[PDB]
Amino acid sequence: QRTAVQGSPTMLAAISKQWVRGAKVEEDRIHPFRKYFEELQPGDSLLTPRRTMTEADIVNFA
Amino acid sequence: QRTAVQGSPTMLAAISKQWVRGAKVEEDRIHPFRKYFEELQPGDSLLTPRRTMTEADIVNFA
Amino acid sequence: QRTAVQGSPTMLAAISKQWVRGAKVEEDRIHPFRKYFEELQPGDSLLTPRRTMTEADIVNFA
């Protein structure tokens, strides 16, 4: 049965068991690529550091 | 016999059968390095795309 | 009073309150550059991943 399920994205993520676009995150102080499969959860997020794009970046990549 | 031939550069290009600095060109829609010897002509030009020189270019080449 | 204290480096480190050369380490799954001052301990160690040196490394650095 095809059911169109509505709600907030943080509710649709727990319904679908998949983080979707705008759900709640779970940042737990260690890197997500260090976790094994059984200790990953859909929603385990990571806020990376920044990188300033410059003209030299464009030159070196081109 | 040494003859000083005067005229327009596009005329000297056809008299001398060699390209002259101010002569006319034949832009030809394909790359002149793709042509063999017999299908090249003196005057077969190429207008390359541009490249913006920057400070990163000077740094990487130095 | 100067005293030449002898013993193992894992003992001299706890005597001096300074990790010295070959003492025991405290690797605790998170980066010591993420720890504040009050939670750094002398002996908090990080074992970094590897980087294979190559001829291109020598060329790009020179």
Side-chain angles (χ1 to χ4, degrees), chain A residues 29 34, chain C residues 25-48:
Chain A
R29 195 180 177 181
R34 294 180 185 271
Chain C
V25 298
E26 202 274 330
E27 294 179 353
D28 54 355
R29 194 180 178 182
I30 55 100
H31 196 191
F33 283 171
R34 295 182 185 271
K35 296 183 178 70
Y36 291 94
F37 182 79
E38 289 84 3
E39 59 184 0
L40 285 173
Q41 297 295 322
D44 290 334
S45 180
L46 178 71
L47 185 61
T48 65

Side-chain angles (χ1 to χ4, degrees), chain A residues 51-62, chain B residues 51-62, chain C residues 60:
Chain A
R51 182 175 177 177
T52 300
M53 296 300 174
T54 184
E55 188 175 2
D57 286 326
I58 301 172
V59 168
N60 287 118
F61 186 76
Chain B
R51 181 175 177 177
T52 301
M53 296 299 175
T54 185
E55 187 176 1
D57 285 326
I58 302 172
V59 167
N60 287 119
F61 188 75
Chain C
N60 287 118

Side-chain angles (χ1 to χ4, degrees), chain A residues 7-57:
Chain A
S8 65
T10 185
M11 192 68 74
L12 293 173
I15 289 167
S16 65
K17 287 184 179 181
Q18 292 176 357
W19 187 83
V20 192
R21 179 62 67 194
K24 63 183 180 292
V25 298
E26 200 276 330
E27 296 178 354
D28 54 355
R29 195 180 177 181
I30 58 101
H31 194 276
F33 286 170
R34 294 180 185 271
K35 296 184 179 71
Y36 290 95
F37 181 79
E38 289 84 3
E39 60 186 359
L40 285 172
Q41 296 295 321
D44 290 333
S45 180
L46 180 69
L47 187 60
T48 65
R50 281 87 65 89
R51 182 175 177 177
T52 300
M53 296 300 174
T54 184
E55 188 175 2
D57 286 326

